[PDB]
Structure 1
Amino acid sequence: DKISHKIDIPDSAWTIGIGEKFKNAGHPNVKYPMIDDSYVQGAPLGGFGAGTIGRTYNGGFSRWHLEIGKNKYTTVYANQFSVFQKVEGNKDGVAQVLYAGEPENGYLSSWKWDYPKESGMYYALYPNSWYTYTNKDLPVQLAVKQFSPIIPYNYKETSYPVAVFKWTAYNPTNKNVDVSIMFTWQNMIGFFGKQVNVNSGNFNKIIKDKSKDSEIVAAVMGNISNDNEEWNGEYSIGVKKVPGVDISYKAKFVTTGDGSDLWHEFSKNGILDNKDDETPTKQDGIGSAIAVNFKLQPGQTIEVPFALSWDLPIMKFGGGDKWYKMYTKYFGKNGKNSFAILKEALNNYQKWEKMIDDWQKPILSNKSKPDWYKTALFNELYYLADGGTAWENGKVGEKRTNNMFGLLECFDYNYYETLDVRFYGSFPLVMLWPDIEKQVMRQFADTINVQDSSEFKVGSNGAMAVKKVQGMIPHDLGSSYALPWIKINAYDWQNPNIWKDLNSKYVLLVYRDYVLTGKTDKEFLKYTWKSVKTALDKLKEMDKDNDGIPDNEGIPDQTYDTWSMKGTSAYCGSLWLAALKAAQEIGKVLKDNEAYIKYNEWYKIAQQNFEKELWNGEYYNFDTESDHKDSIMADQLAGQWYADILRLGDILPKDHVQKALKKIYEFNVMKFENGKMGAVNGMRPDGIVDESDIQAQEVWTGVTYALASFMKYRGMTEEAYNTAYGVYKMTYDKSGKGYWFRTPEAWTKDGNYKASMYMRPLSIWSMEVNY
């Protein structure tokens, strides 16, 4: 490996061999189907709300999130980079697709598949990833750096449906070598959203944009229709000329054939025919190819940038609504702008690289933090783009001030912005994209007094319940299968209108968002204040025994939605205390004296009673009335965690919090698989895992990272990182279960998972305490 020195891959990048098999992979062990797309994954490409494309460590473009809210895992075999190399004065060269695999059927059988093992590496540090190619039959070594411009405090480039592939080629031998790199792409118009004749009308064109000291050559893959529909738009691939390289192309090859129309050209001398052909297809799949060819002398290096863009302006949800995607603000709405996007990328990618470096540097340059922690911190951010992210720039055929936003909780449970989950999962948004975070919370504010008296069947017990109750915060802002932002509470396993955490978590989120953006956004507090008061006031009415605390009802009436709580619970009770303290503080900021006084009185009564009811000398009991009420819950003091973040001080005595955290570390972590897998949710005082519900026996990745944050705030540094380490290990390490770029909600002690691609573990950003 002589190429790694010519490029700048951080030591904290996650790494795996190209073509590596992983032996220990976890699966769901479940009655009903659950997504399991395998361990062959990678860092995604594409901006927020743009639709994303998962290119795997084996090189395939395989995890398609282009249809907003859907996860479709299938390798589009025509989409590849390929290489040709010929040592000068040899009869023949060699051509190889850079993909560690082959097609299942006979399409593209002429191409050279099965990039060999032990011949290159994949590296990831989101939003960047890299491949190196160090192959005994390829004298010139190659690497590519690929990324999209995901940039904190930037709401423009961060939205773009674009990727850059910056190639480096180095000749370590003592012979001249002729080299070509070729990007192939299928015209994917009709891949989704088209009900009949999926390729019909697709056509490809070539754009050559020449100007002083500049040339871009691109293929634009579109359709002859000017229909404004979800399925229609354009893909583009292209390259920018650099000194010493020539460009060749082929406008049209048939993807539903053997591929030799393209491959006989590339494999001969790495130079394509430069044949333009705009003839539209009918049934056959078609694709385009862009290539560069160059001669490398001994010791010579060259760099050449390619790019990919996709202008699919309209997202459609299953309930029928059609919306424009955010990037359309910058490029237009007509779906004929893929070349403009691609050109912006090829003319600005060096600046984008620097902007990414600028935001990663503070963490990377902190040598007190272990590299493993940095691996998880950056790579967990994949989900912000990959989580079905919807970011609208108008309803099709209709203009407001704001752009509504939603991130899915996951794909198995297809709900936008699940509030009980975003309490944990929204840290990257508040810390890095706060204008989005505030928009999401105003969306929740707007829902507080919505009433929907229509009834739905509750999944857990089969009873009927009212959809949305006035004054209760919704569980979620709808589903991609229905009407995001319009029809809320898509979730139906339990009735969220009687949840005891959502209203308090909402208040805590509001105050968090004020505190973590500088304590200056009075307008945001003013916008949300009425909803904050309503939320706490409604929750107060759920106090059935007048101890000043809402009562859990002997059912799963909170985020642990199969784990029953009864009476006063540590979890909902601490959250309530913290939420009252936040509301007092907002009252003071807004000069609402009556509110300050009311919530101060409620707080003092509830705090006193919480302590008496639950403090047992070592930790806080799970609750007052359940069968295993003395279980040690990992999340028992979630309220005090948020209070630390919000700078609200002690809601419980310092000494008692410290003892509780130490007990959680000693038991839920260190007595669960030797502390190598995170914090199990429920442990019995005898040191045996609580078996009363599956959730008690699960580690929740996002709960565990949040707990690590709490420990870190409380000066338990070693316990904090050891607790987080088991999550990193399980996700990323060779000894783990192969969950990279699909971090799940949960695993059990055998390592098998629930709900891959989950929002909650974004909570790792709560560990950026100093920030």
Structure 2
Amino acid sequence: VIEFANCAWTRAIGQGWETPYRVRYASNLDDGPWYGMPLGGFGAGCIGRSSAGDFNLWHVDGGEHIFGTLPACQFSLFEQGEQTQAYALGSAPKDGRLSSWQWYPAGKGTYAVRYPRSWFVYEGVFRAQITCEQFSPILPHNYQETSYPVAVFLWTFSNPTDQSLTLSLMLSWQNTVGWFCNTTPSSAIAIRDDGSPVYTYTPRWGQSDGNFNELIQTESFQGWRLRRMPHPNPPQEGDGEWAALIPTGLGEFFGCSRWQPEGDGAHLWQSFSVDGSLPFVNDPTPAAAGEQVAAAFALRFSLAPGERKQIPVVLAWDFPVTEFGKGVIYYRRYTDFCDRHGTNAVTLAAQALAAYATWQEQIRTWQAPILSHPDWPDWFKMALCNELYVLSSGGSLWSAASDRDPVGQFAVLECLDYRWYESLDVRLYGSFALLQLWPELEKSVMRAFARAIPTADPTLRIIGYFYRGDPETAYKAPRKLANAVPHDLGAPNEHPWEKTNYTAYQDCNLWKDLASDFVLLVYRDFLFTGGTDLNFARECWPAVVAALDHLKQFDQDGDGLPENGGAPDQTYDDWKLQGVSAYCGGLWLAALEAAIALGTLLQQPQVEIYRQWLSQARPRYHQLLWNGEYYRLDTGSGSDVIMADQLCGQFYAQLLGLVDIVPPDCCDRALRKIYDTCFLKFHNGQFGAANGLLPNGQPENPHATHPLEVWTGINFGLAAFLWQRGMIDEAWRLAEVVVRQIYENGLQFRTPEAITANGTFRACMYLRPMAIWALALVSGGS
């Protein structure tokens, strides 16, 4: 019943890792390797469940992260034939809660994922063949269901034995209404040891006062709903409800609305483990001070020899408010298809029960071109889908529609350690999936950038690179200069979209890549959506002009080329560049080309000056940086290092149908050398491409950080570049190594920025790795 297991990530249920990757700095996040596929739409709030069956990831509070199991949130199975057996389908709690429950033995089945579908196939315990397919309706080109806070658990049971079986399927859940909010919002900003600003998150975990549960029973569906008394109007962050439903007509329904998840769970288990029933309870008493509450239902059915039954179970959660900074209130996009009152969980669940099979068909339909591609390896089909997981679990925001944002505004975090949105340098590579599958969301993000470019915040704030532990004497720079390009679209502790350039490790008002990134993204988004959206192009054009003028001020000598200087001033933000760099110089030339193309289409007056700049700048870049084998890092440092991502501009120019920014023979020779050195002489091509090595495969400096890291998303960009330049075998080999490192070593559903050669990672749950879609785009004909 797992469809195309070979294009799915699989692991035996509850099989762990001998030696997973671990975080390279102790102050940074490492929950360990037990992430499974997240459930829930983008910006819906999401929950994750591990390959052991534990619901351990709670992202119901928009942009916030909690990792921890609530053992009572779980499916349990009872079967009786020859023998009687009953198991909760998670791991045994370590702290002794639910001591009466028995837990499914590890290694007795397969967990499989191709996002947004996953499967538990249970085998070798029960006599029935039992599969649970878990999915949310994540649909490309669909700006409705993709936002929904629903998970479908589609169970298939079949009896392969000579004897009739009695089965019962239970879902219990703890009422967490009111838990998912910050009691310390707009808190003091601390500088962490890696230089990043951090805030304090103090959720109301375990605060259940007023929480109650009721059974739901109609002609069509039955289950439970988890609420809180009172429910204010309007709701505040944390206010809402859960529901879970099955259709009627499928067997005998046992409901128990109120049981104690902190106790031994015997009230439930003494019935369930014996005959698959529960004691009848419909008790909406609000929970007392100090008291936790949970609900459960079980469905009991018989399965005759050779019979197959399916049971759809749907969970829905209606938490409509995302509050960011204190008093900064947005509604979630799904509210446009119900309302903003936070009283809709049953109606959402009901819609799911009605539509789940349609949604399942639609998922098979959009994935079918990928799975049937004749020139894509199995691992790639798998990773292409699986890397979409971050669009759900990356602190994703998707707001309610407005006139100027007709499908809502959208944002994914750079990551959990680096808690701000849609970092521009990062999305250069990381935004290829969003462009291809949700181009209206892609456009809203770029429109948010466009609007922010002219704004300013003169307020002086600490720059982390320079911080020496005293706030008052610390070097500070203006939050944002008018017409500078912001690094990001703000943070979940402030105001996403509207308050930009939140990052403070460097002063991004000085960065030399961001302006080019902005232009290249605008043009790419216009071109790859048919070259017809003149509204998008006209809206972004003033910002294109402002961006390029901003970056042109950093051309000190007037040769046409902006020069790096000072603190690290581009995406490799622990790596100092001096003078014209290959990286930023390249992006600049590709940007100018892009602005010339778009500006000509739009008939704009700036086109003449961009052609003059490019006529000076383009020959000059080769003239300055060619060393005979590759492009020099920069003009000022005298470094002999090979930067793997030196010709990012040439990748982009060609991707965009624009003229080569360098001689294609030089491009090809540079790229061959990057591959032969940065990949093949970095521990023999075991990890992928290091960002910078000497021509002999040694580090320039054995202690440097960025040069000696493999950036997953940079590697995917490089693969795409290789493929576009005709080095096909090379692209597939490099991309394979990176996928294997992630999906074999405990990084699945938390893909990081960086791996080292020493079993360590940096910045789990990272935006860049969606760059695997750039390879799909260049190789995908069709």
Give the TM-score band, short-chain normalised. Answer: over 0.9
Aligned to 2:155: 167
Q: Is residue 140 of structure 2 the alignment partner of residue 145 of structure 1?
A: no
Q: Give the drift of 1:675.
A: 1.3
Distance 1:671 1:720 in 2: 16
CA pair 374-402 structure 1, distance change in 2 beyond 3 A: closer
Contact 1:219–1:288, Cα closer than 8 Å, also in 2: yes
**In the alignment, is residue 659 of structure 1 matched against residue 669 of structure 2?**
yes
CA contact (8 A) 1:85 1:179 kept: yes
Structure 2 runs not aligned, ≥5 long: 184-203, 468-474
Per-residue CA distance 1:574-600 (angstroms, 9 max, x = gap) = 0000000000001110012x3222111
* Partner AA of 2:269 in structure 1: W
1:695 Cα deviation after fit: 0.3
Q: Distance in 2 between matches of 1:187 and 1:507?
A: 47
Aligned equivalents of 2:740 and 2:406: distance in 1?
44
Comparing 454-463 with 657-666, greater Cα deviation is found at 454-463
Residue equivalent to 2:470? none
**Does the Cα contact within 8 Å between 2:401 and 2:407 map onto a contact in 1?**
no
1:367 to partner: Cα distance = 2.8
| Structure 2 Cα separation of the partners of residues 165 and 27 of structure 1 | 32
* C-alpha distance in structure 2 between counterparts of 1:54 and 1:9, whole Å: 22
Q: Which residue of 2 aligns with 1:640?
A: 650
Give the match for residue 3 of structure 1. none
Give the deviation of 1:554 after TM superposition. Answer: 4.3
Contact kept? 1:554, 1:626, Cα under 8 Å:
no
- The one-letter code sitting in structure 2 at the alignment partner of 1:636 is Q
Q: How does 1:159-308 map to 2 (within 5 A)?
A: 159-193=147-181, 195=183, 198-210=207-219, 215-227=220-232, 228-241=235-248, 243=250, 245-282=251-288, 283-308=290-315
Aligned amino acid, residue 169 of structure 2: I
- Is the deviation greater in 684-693 or in 273-282? 684-693
Distance 2:727 2:135 in 1: 36
Post-superposition CA distance 1:614-644 (Å, at most 9, x none)? 111211111111242x211110001111112
Supply the distance in 1 between the matched residues of 2:326 and 2:227 (Cα, whole angstroms). 27
Secondary structure at 1:8 match in 2: coil
Looking at structure 2, the residues matched to 554 and 491 of structure 1 have their Cα atoms a distance apart, in angstroms, of 18
Residue 394 of structure 1: how far off its partner (Å): 7.2
Q: Which residue of 2 aligns with 1:505?
A: 517
Q: Offset at 1:535?
A: 0.7
Structure 2 distance, partners of 1:689, 1:474, is 32
Deviation at 1:241, TM superposition (A): 3.4
Distance between the aligned counterparts of 2:106 and 2:399, measured in 1? 43
Question: In 2, are the aligned partners of 1:456 and 1:465 still within 8 Å (CA)?
Answer: yes
Match of 2:697 in 1: 687
2:29 is matched with which residue: 25, 32, 35?
Answer: 35
TM-score (norm. length: structure 2): 0.93
Deviation track 1:496-541 (CA, whole Å, cap 9, x = no partner) reads 0010000110000000100110111111111111110111112111
Q: Which residue of 2 aligns with 1:74?
A: 68
Aligned mates of 2:498, 2:511 — CA distance in 1: 21
SS of the residue corresponding to residue 22 of structure 2 reads: coil
User: Does the alignment pair 1:110 with 2:100?
Assistant: yes
Of residues 709, 714, 734, the one that matches 2:725 is: 714
Instruction: Report whether the alignment pairs 1:53 with 2:47.
Output: yes
RMSD: 1.6
Distance 2:456 2:741 in 1: 43
Within 5 Å, give how 1:583-602 maps onto structure 2. Answer: 583-592=595-604, 594-602=605-613
For residues 492 and 571 of structure 1, what CA distance do their matches in structure 2 show? 22
Look up the match of 1:320: 327
Matched, 1:382 2:389: yes
CA displacement at 1:107 relative to structure 2: 2.3
Distance 2:406 2:713 in 1: 33
Letter in 2 for 1:271: S
Deviation at 1:488, TM superposition (A): 1.6
Counterpart of 1:441, as a letter, is: M
TM-score, with structure 1 as normaliser: 0.95
- Are the equivalent residues in 1 in contact too, given 2:144–2:334 (CA < 8 A)? yes
Task: Determine the structure 1 residue equivalent to 2:3.
Answer: 8
CA distance in 2, matches of 1:554, 1:401: 42
Query: Aligned residue for 2:192?
Result: none
Once the 2 structures are TM-superposed, how far is the Cα of residue 690 of structure 1 from its aligned partner?
3.2
* CA gap 1:319/1:718 in 2 versus in 1, 3 angstroms: farther
How far 1:749 moved relative to its partner? 1.2
| 1:64-95 Cα deviation digits (max 9, x unpaired) | 1111111110001001111101116x6xx221
SS of 1:555's equivalent in the other structure is coil
Q: In structure 2, what is the equivalent of residue 22 of structure 1?
A: 17
Once the two structures are superposed, what CA deviation does each residue of 1:311-364 show, in whole Å capped at 9, x if it has no partner?
011111144312111100001110110000000001100000011111100010
Q: 1 CA distance for matches of 2:375 and 2:515?
A: 38
Q: For residue 649 of structure 1, report the CA deviation from its aligned partner.
A: 3.0
Match of 2:87 among 96, 99, 106: 96
Distance 2:409 2:3 in 1: 37
Segment of structure 1 superposing worse, 398-407 or 151-160:
398-407
Partner SS, residue 135 of structure 1: coil
Say whether 1:747 aligns with 2:741.
no
- Which amino acid letter does the alignment assign opposite residue 767 of structure 2? M
3-state SS, counterpart of residue 393 of structure 1: coil
1:347 aligns with 2:354: yes
The one-letter code sitting in structure 2 at the alignment partner of 1:179 is L
The residue number in structure 2 matching 1:547 is 559
Amino acid of the residue matched to residue 85 of structure 1? E
> Which residue identity is paired with 1:698?
E
Amino acid at match of 1:579: A
- The CA deviation string for residues 256-286 of structure 1, in whole angstroms up to 9 with x for no partner, is 2211111112111002233211111113211
Query: For 2:122 and 2:678, how far apart are their aligned partners in 1?
Result: 44
The letter of the residue matching 2:394 is: G
Asked whether the equivalents of residues 506 and 567 of structure 2 are also in contact (C-alpha less than 8 Å), the reply is: no
1:417 corresponding residue in structure 2 = 422
Indicate the residue corresponding to 2:187 in structure 1.
none
Residue 200 of structure 2: aligned partner: none
| 2:201 aligned partner | none
CA distance in 2, matches of 1:676, 1:55: 30
Contact 2:214–2:284 (8 Å) recurs in 1: yes
Q: Percent identity?
A: 43
Contact 1:265 1:272 (8 Å CA) reproduced: yes
CA contact (8 A) 1:108 1:258 kept: yes
CA contact (8 A) 1:677 1:729 kept: no
Determine if contact 2:2/2:119 at 8 Å carries over to the other structure. no
Q: Distance in 2 between matches of 1:292 and 1:505?
A: 54
- 1:78·1:255 contact (CA, 8 Å) conserved in 2? yes
Aligned position for 1:614: 625
Q: Structure 1 residues 699 and 194 mapped into 2: Cα distance closer, same or farther (>3 Å)?
A: closer
SS, match of residue 552 in structure 1: coil
Q: Which residue of 2 aligns with 1:759?
A: 767
1:433 counterpart (419, 422, 438): 438
Instruction: Tell me the CA shift for residue 399 of structure 1.
Output: 9.6
Per the alignment, in what secondary structure is the counterpart of residue 671 of structure 1?
Answer: coil
- Partners of 1:204 and 1:465 lie apart in 2 by 52
